[PDB]
JSON list of N, CA and C in Angstrom, two decimals:
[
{"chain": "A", "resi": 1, "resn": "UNK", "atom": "N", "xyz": [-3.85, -15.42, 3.88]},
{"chain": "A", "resi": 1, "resn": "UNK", "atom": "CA", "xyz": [-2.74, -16.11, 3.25]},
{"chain": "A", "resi": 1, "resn": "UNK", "atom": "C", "xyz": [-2.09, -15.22, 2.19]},
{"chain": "A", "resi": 2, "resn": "UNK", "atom": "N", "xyz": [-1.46, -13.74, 2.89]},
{"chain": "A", "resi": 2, "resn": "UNK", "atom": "CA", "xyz": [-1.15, -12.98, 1.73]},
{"chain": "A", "resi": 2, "resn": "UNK", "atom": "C", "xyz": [-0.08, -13.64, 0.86]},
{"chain": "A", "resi": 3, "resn": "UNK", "atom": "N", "xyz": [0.40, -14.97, 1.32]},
{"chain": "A", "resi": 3, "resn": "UNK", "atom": "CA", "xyz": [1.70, -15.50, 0.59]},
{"chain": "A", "resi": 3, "resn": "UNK", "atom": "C", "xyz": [2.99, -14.20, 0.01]},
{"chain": "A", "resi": 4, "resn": "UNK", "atom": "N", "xyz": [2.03, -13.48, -0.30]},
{"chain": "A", "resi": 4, "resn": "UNK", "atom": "CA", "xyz": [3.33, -12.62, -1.17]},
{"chain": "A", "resi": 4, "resn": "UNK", "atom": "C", "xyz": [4.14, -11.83, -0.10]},
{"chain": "A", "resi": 5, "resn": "UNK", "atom": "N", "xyz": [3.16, -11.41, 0.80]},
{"chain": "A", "resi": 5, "resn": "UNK", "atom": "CA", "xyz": [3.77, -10.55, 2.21]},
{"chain": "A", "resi": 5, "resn": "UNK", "atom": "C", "xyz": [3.91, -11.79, 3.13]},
{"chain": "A", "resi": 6, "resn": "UNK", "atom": "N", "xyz": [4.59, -13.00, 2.72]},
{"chain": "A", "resi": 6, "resn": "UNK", "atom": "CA", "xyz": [4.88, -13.75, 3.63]},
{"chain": "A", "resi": 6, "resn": "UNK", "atom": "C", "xyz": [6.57, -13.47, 4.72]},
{"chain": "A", "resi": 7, "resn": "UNK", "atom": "N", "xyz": [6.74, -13.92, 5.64]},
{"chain": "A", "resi": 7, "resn": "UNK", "atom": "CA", "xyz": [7.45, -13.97, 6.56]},
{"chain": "A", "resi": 7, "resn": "UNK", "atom": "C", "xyz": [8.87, -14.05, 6.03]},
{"chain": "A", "resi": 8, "resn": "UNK", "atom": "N", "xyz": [9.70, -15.04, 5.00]},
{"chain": "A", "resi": 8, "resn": "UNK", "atom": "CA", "xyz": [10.51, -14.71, 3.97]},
{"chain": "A", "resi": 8, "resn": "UNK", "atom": "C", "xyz": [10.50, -13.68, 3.62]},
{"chain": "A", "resi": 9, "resn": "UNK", "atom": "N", "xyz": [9.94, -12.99, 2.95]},
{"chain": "A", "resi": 9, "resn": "UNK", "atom": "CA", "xyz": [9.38, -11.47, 2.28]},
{"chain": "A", "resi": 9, "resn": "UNK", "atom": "C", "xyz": [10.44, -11.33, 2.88]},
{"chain": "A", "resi": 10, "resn": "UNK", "atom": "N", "xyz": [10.65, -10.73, 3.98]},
{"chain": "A", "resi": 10, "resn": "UNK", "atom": "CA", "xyz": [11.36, -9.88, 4.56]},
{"chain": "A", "resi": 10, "resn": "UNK", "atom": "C", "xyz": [12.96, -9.73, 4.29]},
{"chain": "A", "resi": 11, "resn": "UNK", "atom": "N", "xyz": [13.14, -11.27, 3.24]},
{"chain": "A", "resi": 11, "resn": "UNK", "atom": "CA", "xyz": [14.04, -11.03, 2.96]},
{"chain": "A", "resi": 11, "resn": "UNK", "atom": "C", "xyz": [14.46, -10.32, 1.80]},
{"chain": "A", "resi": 12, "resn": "UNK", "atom": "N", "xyz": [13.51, -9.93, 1.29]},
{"chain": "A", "resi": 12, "resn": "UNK", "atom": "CA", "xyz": [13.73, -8.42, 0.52]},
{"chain": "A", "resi": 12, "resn": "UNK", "atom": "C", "xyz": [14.89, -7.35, 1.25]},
{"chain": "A", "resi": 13, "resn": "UNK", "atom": "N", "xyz": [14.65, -7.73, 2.28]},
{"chain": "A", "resi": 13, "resn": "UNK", "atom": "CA", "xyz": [15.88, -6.60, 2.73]},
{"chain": "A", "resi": 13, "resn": "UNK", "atom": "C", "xyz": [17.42, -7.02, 2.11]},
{"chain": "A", "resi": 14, "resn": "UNK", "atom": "N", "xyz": [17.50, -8.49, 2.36]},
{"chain": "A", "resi": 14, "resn": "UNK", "atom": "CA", "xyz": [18.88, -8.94, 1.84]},
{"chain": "A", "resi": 14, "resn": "UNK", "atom": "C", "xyz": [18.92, -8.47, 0.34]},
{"chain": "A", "resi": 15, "resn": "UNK", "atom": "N", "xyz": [17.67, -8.47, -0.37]},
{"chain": "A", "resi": 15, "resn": "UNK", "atom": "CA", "xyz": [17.70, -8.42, -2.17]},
{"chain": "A", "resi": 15, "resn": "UNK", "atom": "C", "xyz": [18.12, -6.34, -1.96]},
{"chain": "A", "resi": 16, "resn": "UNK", "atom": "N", "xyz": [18.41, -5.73, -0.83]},
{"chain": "A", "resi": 16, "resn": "UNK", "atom": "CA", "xyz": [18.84, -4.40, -0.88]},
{"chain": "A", "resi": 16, "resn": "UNK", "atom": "C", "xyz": [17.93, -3.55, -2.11]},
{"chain": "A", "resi": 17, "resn": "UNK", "atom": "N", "xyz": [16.60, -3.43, -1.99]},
{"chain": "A", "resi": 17, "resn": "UNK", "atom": "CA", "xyz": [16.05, -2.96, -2.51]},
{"chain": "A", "resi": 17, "resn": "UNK", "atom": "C", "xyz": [16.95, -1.53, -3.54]},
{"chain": "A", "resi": 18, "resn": "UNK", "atom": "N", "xyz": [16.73, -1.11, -4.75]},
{"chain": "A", "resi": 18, "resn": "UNK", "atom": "CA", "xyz": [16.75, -0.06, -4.87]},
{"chain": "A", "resi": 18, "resn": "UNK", "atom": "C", "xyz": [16.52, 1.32, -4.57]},
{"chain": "A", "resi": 19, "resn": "UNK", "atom": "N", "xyz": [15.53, 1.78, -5.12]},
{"chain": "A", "resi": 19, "resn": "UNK", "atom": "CA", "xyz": [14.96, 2.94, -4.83]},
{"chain": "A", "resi": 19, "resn": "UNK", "atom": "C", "xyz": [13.64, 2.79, -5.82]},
{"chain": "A", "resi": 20, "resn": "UNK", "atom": "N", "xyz": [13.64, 3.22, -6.85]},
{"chain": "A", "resi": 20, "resn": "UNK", "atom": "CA", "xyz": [12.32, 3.12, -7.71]},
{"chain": "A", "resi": 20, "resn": "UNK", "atom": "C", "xyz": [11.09, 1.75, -7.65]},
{"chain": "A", "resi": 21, "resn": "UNK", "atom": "N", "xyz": [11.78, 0.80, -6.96]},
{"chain": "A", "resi": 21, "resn": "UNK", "atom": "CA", "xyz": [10.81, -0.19, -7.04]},
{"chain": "A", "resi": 21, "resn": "UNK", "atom": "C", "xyz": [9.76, 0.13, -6.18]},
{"chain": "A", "resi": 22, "resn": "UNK", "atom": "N", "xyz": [10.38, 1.16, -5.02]},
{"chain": "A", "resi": 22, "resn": "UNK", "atom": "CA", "xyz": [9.48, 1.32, -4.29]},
{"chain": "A", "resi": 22, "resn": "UNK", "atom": "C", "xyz": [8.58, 2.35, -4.19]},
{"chain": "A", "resi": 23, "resn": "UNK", "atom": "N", "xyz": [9.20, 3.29, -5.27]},
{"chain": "A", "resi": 23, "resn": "UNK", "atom": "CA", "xyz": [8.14, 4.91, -5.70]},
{"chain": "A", "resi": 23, "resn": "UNK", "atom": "C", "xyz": [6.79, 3.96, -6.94]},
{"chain": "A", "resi": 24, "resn": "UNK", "atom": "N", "xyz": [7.25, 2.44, -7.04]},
{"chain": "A", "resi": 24, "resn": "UNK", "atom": "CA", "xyz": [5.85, 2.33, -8.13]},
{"chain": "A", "resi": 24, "resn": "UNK", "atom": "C", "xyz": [5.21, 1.86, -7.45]},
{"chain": "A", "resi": 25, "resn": "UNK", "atom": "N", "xyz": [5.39, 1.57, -5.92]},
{"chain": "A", "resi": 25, "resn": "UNK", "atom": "CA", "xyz": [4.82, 1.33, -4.79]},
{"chain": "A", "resi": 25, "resn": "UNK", "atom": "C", "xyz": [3.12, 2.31, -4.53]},
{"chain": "A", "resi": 26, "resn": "UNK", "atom": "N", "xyz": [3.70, 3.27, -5.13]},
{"chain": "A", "resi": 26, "resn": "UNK", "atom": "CA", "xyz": [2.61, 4.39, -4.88]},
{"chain": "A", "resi": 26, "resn": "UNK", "atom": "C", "xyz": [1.27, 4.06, -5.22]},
{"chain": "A", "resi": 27, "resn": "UNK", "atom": "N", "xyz": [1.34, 3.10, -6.55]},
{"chain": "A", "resi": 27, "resn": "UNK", "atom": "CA", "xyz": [0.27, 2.66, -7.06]},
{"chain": "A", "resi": 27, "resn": "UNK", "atom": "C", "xyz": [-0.33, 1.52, -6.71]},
{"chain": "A", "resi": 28, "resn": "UNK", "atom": "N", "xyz": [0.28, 0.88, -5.98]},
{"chain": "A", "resi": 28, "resn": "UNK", "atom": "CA", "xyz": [-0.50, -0.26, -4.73]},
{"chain": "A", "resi": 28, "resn": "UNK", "atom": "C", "xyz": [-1.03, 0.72, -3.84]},
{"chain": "A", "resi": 29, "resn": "UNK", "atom": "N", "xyz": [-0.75, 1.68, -2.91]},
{"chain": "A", "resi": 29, "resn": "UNK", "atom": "CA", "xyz": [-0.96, 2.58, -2.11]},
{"chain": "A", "resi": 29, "resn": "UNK", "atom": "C", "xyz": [-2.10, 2.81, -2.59]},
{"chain": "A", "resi": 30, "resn": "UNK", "atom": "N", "xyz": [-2.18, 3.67, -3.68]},
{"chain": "A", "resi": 30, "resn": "UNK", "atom": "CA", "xyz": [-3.09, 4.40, -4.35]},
{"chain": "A", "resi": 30, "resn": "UNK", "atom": "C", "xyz": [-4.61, 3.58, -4.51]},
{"chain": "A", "resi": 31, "resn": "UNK", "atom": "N", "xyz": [-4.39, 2.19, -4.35]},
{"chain": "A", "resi": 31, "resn": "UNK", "atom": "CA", "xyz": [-5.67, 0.89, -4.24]},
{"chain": "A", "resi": 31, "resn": "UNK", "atom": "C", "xyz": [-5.94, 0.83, -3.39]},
{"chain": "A", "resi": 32, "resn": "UNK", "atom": "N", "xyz": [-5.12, 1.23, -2.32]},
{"chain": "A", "resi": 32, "resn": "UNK", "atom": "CA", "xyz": [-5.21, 0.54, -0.74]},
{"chain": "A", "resi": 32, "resn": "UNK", "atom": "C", "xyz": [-6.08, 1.78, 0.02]},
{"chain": "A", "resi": 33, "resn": "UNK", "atom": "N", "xyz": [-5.31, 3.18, -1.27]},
{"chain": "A", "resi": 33, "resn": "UNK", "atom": "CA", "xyz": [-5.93, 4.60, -0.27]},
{"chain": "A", "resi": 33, "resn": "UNK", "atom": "C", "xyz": [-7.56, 4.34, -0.53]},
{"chain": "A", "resi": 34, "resn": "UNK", "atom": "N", "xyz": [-7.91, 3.87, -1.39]},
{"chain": "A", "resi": 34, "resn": "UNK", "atom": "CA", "xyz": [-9.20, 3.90, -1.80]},
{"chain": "A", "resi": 34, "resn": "UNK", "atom": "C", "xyz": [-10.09, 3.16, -1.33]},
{"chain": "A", "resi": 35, "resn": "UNK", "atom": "N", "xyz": [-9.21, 2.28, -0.94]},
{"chain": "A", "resi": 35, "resn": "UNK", "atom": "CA", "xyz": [-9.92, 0.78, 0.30]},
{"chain": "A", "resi": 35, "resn": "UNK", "atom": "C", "xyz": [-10.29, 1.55, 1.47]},
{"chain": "A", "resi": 36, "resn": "UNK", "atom": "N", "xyz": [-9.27, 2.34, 2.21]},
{"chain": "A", "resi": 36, "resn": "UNK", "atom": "CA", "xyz": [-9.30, 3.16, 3.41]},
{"chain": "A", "resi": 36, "resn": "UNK", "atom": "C", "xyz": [-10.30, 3.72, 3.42]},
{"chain": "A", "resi": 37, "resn": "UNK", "atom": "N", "xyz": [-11.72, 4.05, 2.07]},
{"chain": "A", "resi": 37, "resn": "UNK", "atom": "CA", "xyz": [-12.70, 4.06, 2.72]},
{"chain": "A", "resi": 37, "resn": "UNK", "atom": "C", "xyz": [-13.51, 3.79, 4.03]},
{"chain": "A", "resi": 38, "resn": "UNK", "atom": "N", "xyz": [-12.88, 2.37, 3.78]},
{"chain": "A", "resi": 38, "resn": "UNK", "atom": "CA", "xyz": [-13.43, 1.63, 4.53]},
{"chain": "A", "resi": 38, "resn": "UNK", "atom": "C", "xyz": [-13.70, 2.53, 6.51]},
{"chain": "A", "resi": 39, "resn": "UNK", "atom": "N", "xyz": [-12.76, 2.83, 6.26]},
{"chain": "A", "resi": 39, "resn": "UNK", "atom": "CA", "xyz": [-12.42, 3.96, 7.45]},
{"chain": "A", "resi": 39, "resn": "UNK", "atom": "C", "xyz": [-13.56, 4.80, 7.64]},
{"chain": "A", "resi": 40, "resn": "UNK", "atom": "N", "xyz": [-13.58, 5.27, 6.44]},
{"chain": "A", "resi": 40, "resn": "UNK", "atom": "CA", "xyz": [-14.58, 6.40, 6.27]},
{"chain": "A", "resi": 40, "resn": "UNK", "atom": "C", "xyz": [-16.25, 6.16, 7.05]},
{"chain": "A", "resi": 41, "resn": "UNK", "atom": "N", "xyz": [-16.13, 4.68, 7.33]},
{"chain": "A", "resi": 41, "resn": "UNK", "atom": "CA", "xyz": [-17.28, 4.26, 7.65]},
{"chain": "A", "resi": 41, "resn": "UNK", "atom": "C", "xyz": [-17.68, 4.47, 9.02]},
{"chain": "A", "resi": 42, "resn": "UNK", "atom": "N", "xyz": [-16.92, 4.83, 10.29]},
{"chain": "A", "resi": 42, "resn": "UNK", "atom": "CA", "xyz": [-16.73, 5.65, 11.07]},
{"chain": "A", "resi": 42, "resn": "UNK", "atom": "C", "xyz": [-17.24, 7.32, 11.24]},
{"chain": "A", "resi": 43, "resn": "UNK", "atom": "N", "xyz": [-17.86, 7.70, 10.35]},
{"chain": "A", "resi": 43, "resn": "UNK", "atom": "CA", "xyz": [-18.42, 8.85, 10.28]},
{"chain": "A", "resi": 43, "resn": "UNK", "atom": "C", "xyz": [-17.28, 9.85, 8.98]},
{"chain": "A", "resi": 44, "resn": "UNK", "atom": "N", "xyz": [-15.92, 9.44, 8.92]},
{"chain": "A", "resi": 44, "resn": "UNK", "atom": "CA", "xyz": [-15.16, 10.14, 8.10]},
{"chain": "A", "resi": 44, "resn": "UNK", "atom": "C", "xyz": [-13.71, 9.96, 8.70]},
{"chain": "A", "resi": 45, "resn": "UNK", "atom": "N", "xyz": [-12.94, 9.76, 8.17]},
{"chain": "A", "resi": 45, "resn": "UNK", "atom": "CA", "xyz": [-11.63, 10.36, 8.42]},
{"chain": "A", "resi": 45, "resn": "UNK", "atom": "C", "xyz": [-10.61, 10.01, 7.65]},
{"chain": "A", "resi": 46, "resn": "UNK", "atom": "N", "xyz": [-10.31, 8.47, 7.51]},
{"chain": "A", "resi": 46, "resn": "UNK", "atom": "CA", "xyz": [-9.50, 7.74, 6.03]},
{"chain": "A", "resi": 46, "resn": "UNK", "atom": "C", "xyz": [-9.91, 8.02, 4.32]},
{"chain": "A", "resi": 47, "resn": "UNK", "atom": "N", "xyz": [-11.33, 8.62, 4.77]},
{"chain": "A", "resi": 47, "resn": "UNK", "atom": "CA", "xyz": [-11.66, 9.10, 3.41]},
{"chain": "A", "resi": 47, "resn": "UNK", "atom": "C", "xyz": [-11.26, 10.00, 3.14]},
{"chain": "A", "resi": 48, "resn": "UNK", "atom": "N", "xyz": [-10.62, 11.38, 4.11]},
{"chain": "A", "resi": 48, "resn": "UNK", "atom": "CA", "xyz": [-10.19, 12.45, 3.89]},
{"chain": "A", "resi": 48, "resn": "UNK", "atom": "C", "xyz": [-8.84, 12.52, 2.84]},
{"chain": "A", "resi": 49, "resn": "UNK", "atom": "N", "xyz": [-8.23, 11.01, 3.45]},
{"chain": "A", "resi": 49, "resn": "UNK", "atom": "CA", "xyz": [-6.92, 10.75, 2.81]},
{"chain": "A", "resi": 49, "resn": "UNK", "atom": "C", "xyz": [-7.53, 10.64, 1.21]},
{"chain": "A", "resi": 50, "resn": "UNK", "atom": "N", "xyz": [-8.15, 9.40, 1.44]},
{"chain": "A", "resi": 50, "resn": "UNK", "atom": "CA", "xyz": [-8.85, 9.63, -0.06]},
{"chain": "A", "resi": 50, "resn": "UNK", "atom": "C", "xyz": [-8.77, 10.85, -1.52]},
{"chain": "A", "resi": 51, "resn": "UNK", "atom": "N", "xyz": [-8.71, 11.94, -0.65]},
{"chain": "A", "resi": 51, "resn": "UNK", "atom": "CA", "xyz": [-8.47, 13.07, -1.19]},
{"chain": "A", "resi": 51, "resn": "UNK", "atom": "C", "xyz": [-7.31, 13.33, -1.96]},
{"chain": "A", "resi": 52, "resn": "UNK", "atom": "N", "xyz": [-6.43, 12.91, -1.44]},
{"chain": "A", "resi": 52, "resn": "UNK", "atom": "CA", "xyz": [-4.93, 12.76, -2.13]},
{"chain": "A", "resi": 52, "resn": "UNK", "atom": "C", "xyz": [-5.14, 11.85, -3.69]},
{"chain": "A", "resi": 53, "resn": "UNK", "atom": "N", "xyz": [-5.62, 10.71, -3.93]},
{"chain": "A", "resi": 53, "resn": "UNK", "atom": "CA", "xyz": [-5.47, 10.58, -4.99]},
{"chain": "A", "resi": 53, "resn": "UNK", "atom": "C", "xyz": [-6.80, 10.65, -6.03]},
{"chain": "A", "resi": 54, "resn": "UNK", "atom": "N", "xyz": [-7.77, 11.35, -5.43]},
{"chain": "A", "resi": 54, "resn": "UNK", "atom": "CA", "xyz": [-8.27, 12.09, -6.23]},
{"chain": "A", "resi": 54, "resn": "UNK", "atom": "C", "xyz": [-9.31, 11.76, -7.33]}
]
């Protein structure tokens, strides 16, 4: 029930996003790269990404 990434959401496109809202995007990413462990659990490979933020 991500509610927030709900199906509406999408109408973010009509709100014509800027630009910067979505470079602070990086820092959701940056939670999510670290989740991508999870990957890692496969013997390795999403953890490699991992690497990027360090």
């Amino acid at each position: 029930r991500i509610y927030k990434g709900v199906i509406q959401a999408i109408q973010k496109s009509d709100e014509g996003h800027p630009f910067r809202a979505y470079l602070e995007s990086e820092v959701a990413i940056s939670e999510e790269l670290v989740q991508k462990y999870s990957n890692s659990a496969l013997g390795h490979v999403n953890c490699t990404i991992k690497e990027l933020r360090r």
